[model samples]
Target: LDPVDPNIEPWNHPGSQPKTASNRAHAKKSAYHSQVAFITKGLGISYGRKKRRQRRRPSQGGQTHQDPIPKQPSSQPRGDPTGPKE
Candidate 1:
């Protein structure tokens, strides 16, 4: 039977509900599976990257440290004995 048939109301529906405990259990199981299906199929790509943690991994730990980091200028003249003087 097609679980999604509109004629077949949901387990929680006021008109037609699961007949027995087993039926209720089966309906709950199917509902859970459907929820997972909607997530994996319908919302998969759209939810991408939003689930990432704000903090970096422990291996990448380090926010502030004073080190004389050298800067490289974009334009430099090559084949000259002396470097470009400011």
Candidate 2:
């Protein structure tokens, strides 16, 4: 004996609605795979750069203690005889 309830309406009581003014079925097929690939590639590149910047922050913190010294003119010779240009 079948015990299924015949009164229960199917989940999709309302038929599928059109996504846009033009019927998607009759419209020209789109490059669905290519669109997905393009979006994935762009997101991958964006996330890869974000990860690299996150990894680089800690390394950069170690070099922040140096004081900025005024640059001496390269044309003038330094007084120190032991310097590189001596």
Candidate 3:
């Protein structure tokens, strides 16, 4: 799997997998397939550190954990093209 492009994969061909929100959500659920999600969700942290942290708690939503990615300054454009635009 290409670690760079989370949306492009062998299983992502036009007919390879059904095109649906559930499928896309499921795909993003895998950490190996969604490293950005992994990092943004705070999966890079060790359990000890995670358990001790008081803010932005971590959670397991299926395979990928959920941790709020800290909000950046609105004036600065984020490097992630797929990140929310607002």
Candidate 4:
């Protein structure tokens, strides 16, 4: 019966209800929790980790996307560590 303006949004008030604040604070948790939920969850950036998994994936499964960089060249053709006569 009372049209009181004491509070409408809240009982849930006092908070700016900032989404960035929530995310910024939980940035660590957010990035870690990101698999599919955070990727698809109302995010406005492309920092999702789906790209990382696919990066290595293309090299193996796709094969066409080879990005290998041989570290120690001599190690590959010379005295390999297979049956080290030790």
Candidate 5:
């Protein structure tokens, strides 16, 4: 005769066992995307604060606007010499 522990659960054993079809039906569910996005936004606040600090530097006699430079096309491609041209 073999002896077994009656208090042990079947799933905790070290051998392969079969489960019912009903057990496999409800194993998957959707995640909380809104909560994940809220946590990510909270973590990114430091980067926004750093950018604001750089933009508000104490210089230039209190001028808040700067003129944009006109764009000029390059004569040749800036990347690999053996690649295709844009």
Candidate 6:
């Protein structure tokens, strides 16, 4: 209906990712939701603006990301203590 070609980038076009939202969509809205919002003080009141705690379950050897599950079974033993005579 309107002049879409002027500011819109038709979805079927080669690159239409930008057209997903018009120009004045989320350009500027007084920090309603933005990355720097937290950095400045727009996030909350005074409790805190950044993280200050640990929630990794306490680990070591940088095993959280890559530590190989260890290819073995729960219980692996030799022929046992009983003597076997044949």
Best by TM-score: 3
30-53: candidate 4 lDDT, tens digit per residue: 554322222233332464434433
Give the per-residue lDDT digits (tens) of candidate 6, residues 52-79: 1112223212121111112311111121
1-86, model 1: which lDDT tens digit per residue?
22342122221211112212333646433533222222123322343423222121221111110111113211222222223211
CA deviation > 4 Å runs, candidate 5: 1-47, 51-56, 65-86
Separately for all candidates shown, the number of backbone clashes (residues 3 or more apart, or on different chains) is 0, 0, 0, 0, 0, 0
Query: Model 1: how far is 85 from its true place, Å?
Result: 83
Query: In model 5, how large is the Cα lDDT of residue 3?
Result: 22
Q: Better model by TM-score, 1 or 6?
A: 1
- Score candidate 3 by TM-score against the native: 0.20
Best by lDDT: 3
lDDT of 1: 0.23
Least lDDT summed over 10 consecutive residues: which range in candidate 6?
9-18
Displacement of the residue 59 alpha carbon in candidate 4, Å: 4.0
Per-residue lDDT of 28 in model 2: 20
Clashing pairs in 5: none
Which lDDT values do the candidates have, in the order given? 0.23, 0.21, 0.28, 0.26, 0.20, 0.23
Lowest summed-lDDT stretch of 10 residues in model 3?
9-18
Candidates ranked by TM-score: 3, 1, 6, 4, 2, 5
For candidate 5, which ten residues in a row score worst on lDDT? Answer: 9-18
Task: Name the regions of candidate 2 deviating beyond 4 angstroms.
Answer: 1-68, 73-76
Error of 5 at 58 (Å): 1.5
Per-prediction CA RMSD (Å) = 27.3, 29.3, 11.8, 22.4, 26.2, 24.2
